[PDB]
Amino acid sequence: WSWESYLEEQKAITAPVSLFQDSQAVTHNKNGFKLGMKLEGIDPQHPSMYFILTVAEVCGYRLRLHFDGYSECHDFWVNANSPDIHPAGWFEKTGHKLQPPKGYKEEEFSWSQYLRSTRAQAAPKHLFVSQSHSPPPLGFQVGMKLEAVDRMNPSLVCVASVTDVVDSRFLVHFDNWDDTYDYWCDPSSPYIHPVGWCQKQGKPLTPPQDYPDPDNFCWEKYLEETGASAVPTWAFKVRPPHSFLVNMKLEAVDRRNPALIRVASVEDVEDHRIKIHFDGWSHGYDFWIDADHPDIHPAGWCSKTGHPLQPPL
Numbered sequence: 001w002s003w004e005s006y007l008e009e010q011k012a013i014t015a016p017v018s019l020f021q022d023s024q025a026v027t028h029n030k031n032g033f034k035l036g037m038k039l040e041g042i043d044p045q046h047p048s049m050y051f052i053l054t055v056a057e058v059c060g061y062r063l064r065l066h067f068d069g070y071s072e073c074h075d076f077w078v079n080a081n082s083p084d085i086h087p088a089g090w091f092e093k094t095g096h097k098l099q100p101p102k103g104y105k106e107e108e109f110s111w112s113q114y115l116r117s118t119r120a121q122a123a124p125k126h127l128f129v130s131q132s133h134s135p136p137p138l139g140f141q142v143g144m145k146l147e148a149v150d151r152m153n154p155s156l157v158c159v160a161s162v163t164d165v166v167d168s169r170f171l172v173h174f175d176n177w178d179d180t181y182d183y184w185c186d187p188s189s190p191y192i193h194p195v196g197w198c199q200k201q202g203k204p205l206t207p208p209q210d211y212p213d214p215d216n217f218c219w220e221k222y223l224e225e226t227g228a229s230a231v232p233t234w235a236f237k238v239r240p241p242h243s244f245l246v247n248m249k250l251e252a253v254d255r256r257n258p259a260l261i262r263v264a265s266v267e268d269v270e271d272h273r274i275k276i277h278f279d280g281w282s283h284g285y286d287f288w289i290d291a292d293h294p295d296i297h298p299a300g301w302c303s304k305t306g307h308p309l310q311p312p313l
């Protein structure tokens with residue numbers, strides 16, 4: 001099975017490499033993560049939280065991570081160039097809380113101690129694209145407030161705060177709702193807006209959970225009472241729409257089984273999202289995804305990085 005003859009017979013084209021970010025497309029980077037290495041990372045299900053993680057498996061430019069002390073059924077996959085993982089010691093250097101391994105208390109964890117107990121090796125620093133050393137996203141400070149789309153309920157735009165800053169990105173948290181709604185982004189995110197936006201657009205604005213009298217929510221007053229500034233207007237950047245077109249072919253990570261990367265088609269487009277369809281599978285497995293998502297790649301990525309590719313069914 002090859003991309004070449006498959007394209008021939010389908011009279012199809014692949015999405016050009018140029019339609020992707022460099023980090024989605026890059027194949028010549030070696031993967032230096034080795035089995036048993038320990039590091040720190042965000043929980044995908046709790047994007048504001050950081051845990052002790054061990055490399056459980058390495059495949060191509062990808063690695064499977066395991067939550068030390070917890071069940072293997074929580075394991076997840078990231079790419080070797082993910083910004084959501086950090087070297088041992090990072091949490092305490094950059095102001096982040098670390099949840100310790102199951103059984104430990106947060107006033108009982110020490111890397112040096114834990115490395116002795118487990119006889120384990122920390123993932124070397126140089127492997128991580130993200131260590132909080134590069135320029136911060138201009139204008140966005142921890143504490144500042146803005147309006148953001150609830151990506152879980154995307155029809156809503158809500159009162160939100162910047163609660164974390166890590167290298168070129170920041171974390172958007174929805175005032176007084178659970179952290180499970182938080183998501184990471186950057187100045188160009190299509191889902192974020194200055195304080196005031198909902199009002200200039202005619203749109204209704206979703207106030208923090210439990211805010212007395214939602215319809216008469218007042219930004220100016222809420223800011224004063226919470227001792228907070230609004231992200232300044234100039235900080236927000238227009239991201240241009242992606243250039244993907246319906247029926248372009250590519251490679252995408254399987255959601256229901258994330259170990260696998262399948263042949264894929266662009267089923268439907270939006271300005272910033274694409275709908276993925278896995279060739280020869282039922283359309284019921286189709287799903288939408290942002291165009292900058294680390295888990296879509298150009299044709300040949302699997303080949304060039306040495307990760308198996310699932311041919312169409």
Ligand SMILES: O=C(c1cncc(Br)c1)N1CCC(N2CCCC2)CC1
Binds near residue numbers: 177
């Ligand atoms: O489940 C919902 C919901 C309920 N009914 C209609 C919609 Br549309 C959404 N909500 C309201 C929105 C809440 N978001 C707002 C900001 C983050 C949480 C989550 C719970």
